[PDB]
Design a protein around this ligand. Structure first.
Ligand code: SF4
Ligand code: SF4
Ligand code: SF4
Ligand code: SF4
Ligand code: SF4
Ligand code: SF4
Ligand code: SF4
Ligand code: SF4
Ligand SMILES: [Fe+3]
Ligand SMILES: [Fe+3]
Lengths: 169, 766, 766, 169
């Protein structure tokens, strides 16, 4: 699946925007991370995405930051997920001295999925302007404020792209 | 006798209090845009915290932008107050007494900022002048080349927040007195609400706005002409709540109805039910005239703040202006004379009903039209990209093309009726009318009850609940307020209010939140207002009133400190906010906050030590106040008994933050009510509700940090005290005495019944 | 006796006047951004005049945005006024008389809006309260869901503009009275100005801001301690003009100096000359603290509107605070107590001078450092892209690399010292210091003279010039005011002022414009203030004062109508503005407008029928007022004698527009002074200057439309009357009587000495 | 010369921006116009650009709207130039009923040159949002609010690009 052809936006935060990446590029970026974090939302998270979030966590062995009420459905799944409010997380990620969720420090790659675009773009606006933290959005929508992101995708293409990514981890 | 801050200036609370609040609850800046376009040197790209041409950095500018929204909200409530005060003084005299019910501490917010305890309309003038004077000083600080430090814009914003509640207080007390609104009434009457409550056969006068003044003449004209049962009069936004508070002090049956929140404005218009629309000010859609016009609904602008470029007929004869409107010659007019407004709107309504019925208007598309326009959809994705709620319209169209309208039916309640989607549809499909047509069934069922705006919390209720609130045995005050820009539909506030009412918290609500809370019924067909008593009490649900009534929520918390704790109010905001932050469990919720007014209200709650959870769209305000729970030195206060530093638990962990879903919001709010001074039974109770709600809505496991709030075995939830003591020993290494089942070692914070936690050194005995 | 609008509300002038002005001078909307980010429903893409989620369209929002800048500017002057009024009343009493010079019509703007003619400080209170009350109503209209029609935001903006001049008037008259400022003085003393006028060997107290109150204590302390000749005290922005007006009513020699406009703020700091910096409010850079700190310059914040997050020492002992500052422990502090401010700043300055000299500081890079950093340039183009003036820095670097510093030397005067370029340079080259180092020679020559803020125009001068102005024989009033955000350097205002002074127009100036106008000298080494007399007279140049003094410019025009024409001022703005628009030739110029204050001032001039030309950056304000010269029905008024419609020439052709270059601005301003009621000699004279200036600056040929302003042969410029009559016959077909040399046919507008042109029907005899 | 590789901006008016065109594309667009107008500025107009403005006017026989004080130098040149303020012109161009500079109506293609980028972007913001008028910027800078524009160019490349355009008219 081509996940880089559509980067349309309704409104813009300005001249700085994320680089659109393919499923294989995202896979390579994620595998190279030394201490990645899977930041999961709830409002755009459906059962199909939930299944893929679990496989990504496992295939790459990435801890999960269950934001919103995502832990509600991740709790009965075999993954390492811990609850944390997204706004708080977005703030903490900008603090070099944050012990992180397991106490072992901050992260070097944030992977976002399951969020409405307006909310994650806002939470991400902090790290974008006040940190050198790298972030990668793998939603069905183009996310301007991530370091890199998938472009806008039909639901089906999204599911396909995530499967291609998983097959590359 | 008075505190140190009478009629304070911008810097009044800066060093003594605001900076202390801001050191713990740190400003979290999330820019809504990476640029600043304030002046001609710009626009300036501030990306990466760069500085504009003038020298201000990104954080400074965003502090400035949040500050601007706050003072804009502050000015709205104030301008509202000034107009009611002048009109009411002119009509009933300066000596009219402020009759607000059974209370001796009549105007807490006013008294705190000015030291004045006004008892009449005229006595409120000096407070109003003070607010207007300060707003001019505040608006001037928005000018380029003024403040540049983010933290100082935040202090200026907090100060403005205190001013907002002063202005809101002024607004509501003068109308409660002059218009005989309920007087701190636990039994204010239930008013019918919802688009489904309207009797389509009757002429319908629809009012949208905030200032109820002009509507009172409309209602007076209806009563005088025996029209209360012949026509319908219903409102959208606050004016709907205030108009249904009018002359209700004696609990007479309401004869008017309430349509709904701001989200219903375009929806009710598109339905074609209104025969005449009268707008006032604030939260009024900017496309009302052209939309009303399509269905031959005359529009009357009754407030100078919104004139829509319409012809002015304030000094014209009523009969002739009515002819111009009924004939459709002009789509509407400006009518600023209240004596003419009453008669004009009511009569035009009675006369428009037959005219519009004879017109043969079909507001929504027919069955055939619906199927056709749906089949026209190209699945181009434009609408979804333009939808503020990011609703998957293309998917709904897809399913509707094959007779499955379940998607569109569910969309109806989440859709805020803004029509951005329609403007981007190349096939020119009136998407909103598609949703409304398919939602007819659901709309006919939109019938609820809302208990009328009750007004203040009485001194009697403060005496009844004061101690309980402070010990913590009454788990806290839950305030559900604000706008309808929800991210997941309007039933959220209902589920939330219910969860808390069942767990016996004190729930109060106002504005659009109060409205939606009463839009749903249980298996027995009963509303929350019917299931729970209306007093300020545990397990009670009180609709305080319109948005300006939010001043009674901070007012109630302030009265706990003034009446229960007997603290001085006059010029003493810092001591009062500090007392609340340390000893009064409470948490606000503005799940659908959208307006500048919501930012000022929330900021006002914050300066009084009251945390608030906002919905996800609120992240767009640019500035949140969140504490770092992992930094030890952020959680220390003084013991006023000796001046020694003492540690406090991390509660609340924020003052202003956003939650993503209503399920997340609940446990967050419960936890937010935990206070340093909870006694043992109180803490045990608060920990019970929070830990239980966290398990219920977030996965079934306990909060990882639950142990951080345990000083002794007595703080532990009674039913599971055994298992918990095990966990403390097991997963934390605490020493337990299994004979008497108590804690020997482990807690980093000790229990001390005589401790006096305060963030203000000046209140300590050194 | 009074007009129809006493203490008007937002709608006061809407239908009677504003809408009439707006029908002719149409709002031209040029969005600065295609989005709106006011609330959480957004941001909304308004591109293509789409509507936001709330319903407001692009034009409505941009009207709203311009309106916001206007009220922000209005609040600035007002907040300023309120602080001076309270402080001055507290220090000198409410009964202190307003001594402003030889005039009986003391407060035209105030009287027009309130009907009041205050004679003391206390008597000004009611006007100040009115303004603050209206500002709250105006700020509330900026809230989402309020006004949506662009034209109504424009009316609200014009109204605010009238309020701005009321607030400015209040500000200046109270300080002129209490601080003994010049009293409408044609011989106010010349003050030295420019970074080159500073005696580097003396300690230097630099003040930046607007409110002169605190500076007066500084100066009082210097006089009391015989320091006026031992140290230098100079300011940037308005405070520089007001501090040099202090106790100058008796024309004593100035002992203080003026550095320059806002553009000099970073430049003077980078020079390292200041030993201490004291900021007040408005137009103060947001990066002063970190920049000052680099060169060990302590910063003192004396106004709560700008505290920079600095520690507060208002209640600390002076000696200790001085030790904290001189030791460099803290980069600066907040000092809000005026009694402590005076002593603190002056003493710290005397003491800092030696300390900083001993520090061995080299403010700018050495010769070697300059050559090295220049050689580091990579010609990446980043600085040019980020420069607000789009200065080709890469080219200058290129030439400087090979010893040709002519490019950098010319850049110095065009550069506004904003340092945006430095933030984007990957080689971290302090570009601004490169320009300043290379400009040392030119800076040493930056020495001029500025005639002190003179105050109001006296009734005597109004009587002397009234008739002439109205007939047109005195070509018009030229007001050069406003900010230094010029697009082509700061000498433009000089050339413009000169051209007009030589052609005998009445030239008045204020603020940064007044400053730069005096920064240049002719072949004889004389300034314009020296070459031309300071009275309000033909060929005269008067520096009215600081930006708040702009109120005396509209005030003078208003007094022409009140004194010459004997029209009533009280509650009669529309008649006065209408009179001015029809009979008083004038044109404002804000060539470097940048601030919100400039938009409000210009908008205030507009509501009084006074056109204004703004510099190109001003196009960023979003809304211009321009008439269509090709639409016949846009140029008709009534003849008050009979109520009949009558045609008027297309003059002025705009109320608020931008010009690109100073050469274009000149002829535009001259033409803008032509008025419908010019008598024959007046018109001939105005046509002479305009046609000549158009030929001189725009190609040598005559204005294509010059013939549109000819009613009879007597309107023709006398020297070229022959040739002109030929052209009218030749290229226009007019019938001429070559015997007496007059016009027989051709003019579409006739000359009528008794005609009474007015845009207000209510003033006509029907 | 490649006039489309650099479209950097310091700030943005939003998601809508001009299409970058080559010298030959601009030449073809201009030749196809039935009633084009050459809108000339002054602040960024140098002697070299002045010479090229004259050749373009002649080679394509395009009337010139001399804005600012450009008529000062165009007057002594053999071209059809007439003075008009840029702000006024930007407004009038949005009025379908404007008789234009010669009285024969409005135009179907506006060619801008010699302006500072901030000023023309503002004047052009009106036509961009309130008209369907086509505009083509041929400055040395990328102009966001034109229908199409050259990208950012070195002065030399600008001179070269304009010569290529002229050779194609
Ligand atoms: S451009 Fe204005 S805030 Fe974004
Ligand atoms: S206020 Fe400052 S950051 Fe904003 S546009 Fe003006 S110079 Fe730029
Ligand atoms: S009307 Fe409803 S579906 Fe359309 S953009 Fe607004 S919220 Fe979305
Ligand atoms: S914008 Fe219109 S055509 Fe495109 S997917 Fe939406 S409803 Fe269908
Ligand atoms: S995004 Fe804010 S004004 Fe542009
Ligand atoms: S005020 Fe209107 S146009 Fe602006 S962001 Fe809010 S909904 Fe959008
Ligand atoms: S300091 Fe001067 S050269 Fe640099 S960006 Fe500002 S105006 Fe341009
Ligand atoms: S940003 Fe720096 S390196 Fe690039 S051209 Fe400008 S001065 Fe040279
Ligand atoms: Fe409301
Ligand atoms: Fe100024």
């Amino acid at each position: 699946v081509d996940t880089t052809k559509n980067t349309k936006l309704f409104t813009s935060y300005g001249v700085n925007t994320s680089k659109a990446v393919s499923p294989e590029m995202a896979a390579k970026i994620i595998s190279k991370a030394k201490r990645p974090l899977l930041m999961v939302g709830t409002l755009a998270l459906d059962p199909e995405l939930l299944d893929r979030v679990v496989k990504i966590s496992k295939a790459a062995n990435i801890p999960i930051a269950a934001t919103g009420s995502s832990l509600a459905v991740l709790a009965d799944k075999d993954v390492d997920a811990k609850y944390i409010n997204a706004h708080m997380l977005g703030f903490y990620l900008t603090d070099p001295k944050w012990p992180g969720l397991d106490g072992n420090g901050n992260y070097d790659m944030i992977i976002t999925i399951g969020f409405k675009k307006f909310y994650i773009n806002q939470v991400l606006s902090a790290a974008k302007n006040f940190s050198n933290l790298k972030t990668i959005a793998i939603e069905r929508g183009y996310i301007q404020n991530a370091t890199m992101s998938f472009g806008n995708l039909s639901k089906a293409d999204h599911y396909a792209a995530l499967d291609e990514l998983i097959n590359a981890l | 006798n008075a505190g140190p801050t009478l009629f304070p200036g911008l810097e009044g609370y800066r060093d003594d209090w605001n900076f202390k609040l801001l050191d713990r609850y740190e400003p979290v800046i999330t820019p809504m845009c990476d640029q600043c376009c304030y002046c001609t040197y710009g626009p300036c790209d501030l990306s990466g915290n760069k500085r504009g041409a003038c020298g201000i950095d990104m954080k400074g500018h965003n502090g400035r932008e949040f500050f601007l929204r706050v003072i804009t909200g502050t000015a709205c409530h104030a301008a509202h107050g000034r107009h009611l005060l002048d009109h009411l003084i002119e009509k009933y005299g300066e000596d009219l007494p402020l009759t607000l019910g059974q209370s001796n501490v009549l105007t807490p917010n006013i008294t705190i900022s000015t030291g004045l305890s006004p008892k009449t309309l005229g006595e409120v003038k000096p407070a109003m002048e003070y607010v207007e004077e300060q707003l001019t000083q505040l608006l001037a600080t928005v000018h380029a080349g003024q403040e540049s430090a983010e933290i100082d814009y935040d202090s200026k914003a907090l100060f403005s927040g205190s001013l907002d509640h002063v202005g809101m207080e002024i607004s509501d007390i003068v109308q409660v007195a002059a218009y005989d609104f309920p007087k701190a009434d636990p039994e204010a009457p239930l008013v019918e609400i919802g688009m489904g409550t309207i009797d389509k056969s009757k002429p319908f006068l629809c009012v949208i706005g905030h200032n109820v003044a002009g509507v009172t003449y409309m209602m007076d004209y209806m009563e005088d002409n025996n029209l209360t049962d012949k026509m319908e009069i219903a409102g959208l936004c606050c004016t709907a709540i205030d108009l249904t508070r009018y002359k209700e002090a004696d609990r007479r049956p309401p004869y008017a109805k309430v349509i709904g929140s701001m989200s219903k404005e375009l929806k009710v218009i598109r339905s074609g039910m209104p025969d005449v629309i009268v707008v006032d000010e604030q939260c009024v859609r900017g496309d009302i005239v052209p939309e009303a016009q399509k269905l031959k609904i005359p529009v009357i602008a009754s407030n100078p703040k919104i004139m829509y470029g319409l012809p002015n007929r304030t000094d014209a004869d009523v009969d002739e202006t009515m002819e111009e409107l009924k004939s459709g010659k002009i789509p509407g007019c400006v009518m600023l004379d209240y004596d003419k407004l009453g008669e004009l709107c009511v009569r035009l309504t009675m006369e428009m009903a037959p005219i519009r019925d004879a017109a043969g208007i079909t507001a929504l598309p027919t069955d055939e039209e619906l199927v056709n326009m749906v089949a026209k959809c190209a699945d181009c994705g434009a609408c979804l990209l333009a939808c503020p709620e990011e609703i998957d319209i293309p998917e709904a169209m897809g399913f509707a093309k094959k007779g499955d309208f379940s998607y569109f039916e569910e969309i109806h309640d989440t859709c805020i009726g803004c029509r951005r989607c329609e403007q981007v549809c190349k096939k020119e499909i009136p998407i909103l009318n598609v949703i409304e047509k398919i939602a007819q069934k659901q709309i006919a069922e939109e019938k609820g009850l809302m208990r009328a705006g009750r007004g203040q919390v009485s001194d009697a209720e403060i005496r009844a609940e004061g101690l309980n609130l402070v010990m913590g045995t009454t788990p806290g005050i839950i305030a559900i307020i604000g706008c309808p820009n929800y991210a997941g539909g309007t039933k959220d506030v209902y589920y939330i209010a219910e969860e808390f009412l069942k767990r016996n918290f004190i729930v109060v609500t106002t504005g659009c939140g109060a409205m939606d809370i009463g839009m749903f019924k249980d298996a027995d067909g009963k509303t929350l207002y019917e299931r729970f008593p209306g007093g300020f009490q545990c397990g009670g649900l009180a609709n305080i009133g319109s948005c300006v009534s939010n001043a009674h929520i901070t007012g109630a918390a302030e009265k706990v400190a003034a009446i229960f704790a007997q603290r001085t109010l006059e010029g003493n905001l810092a001591e009062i906010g500090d007392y609340i932050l340390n000893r009064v469990g409470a948490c606000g919720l503005a799940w659908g906050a959208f307006s500048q007014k919501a930012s000022s209200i929330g900021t006002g709650c914050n300066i009084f030590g009251i945390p608030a959870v906002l919905g996800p769209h609120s992240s767009k305000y640019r500035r949140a106040l969140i504490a770092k729970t992992y930094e030890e030195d952020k959680w220390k206060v003084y013991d006023a008994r000796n001046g020694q530093e003492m540690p406090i638990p991390p509660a609340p962990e924020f003052l202003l933050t956003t939650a993503e879903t209503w399920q997340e919001a609940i446990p967050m709010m419960a936890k937010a009510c935990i206070r340093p001074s909870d006694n043992s039974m109180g803490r045990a109770i608060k920990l019970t509700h929070w830990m239980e709600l966290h398990k219920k809505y977030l996965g079934g496991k306990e909060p990882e940090d639950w142990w951080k709030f345990v000083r002794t075995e007595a703080d532990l939830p009674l039913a599971t005290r055994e298992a918990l003591l095990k966990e403390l020993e097991k997963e934390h290494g605490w020493e337990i005495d299994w004979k008497r089942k108590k804690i020997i070692s482990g807690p980093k914070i000790k229990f001390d019944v005589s401790a006096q936690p305060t963030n203000l050194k000046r209140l300590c005995k050194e």
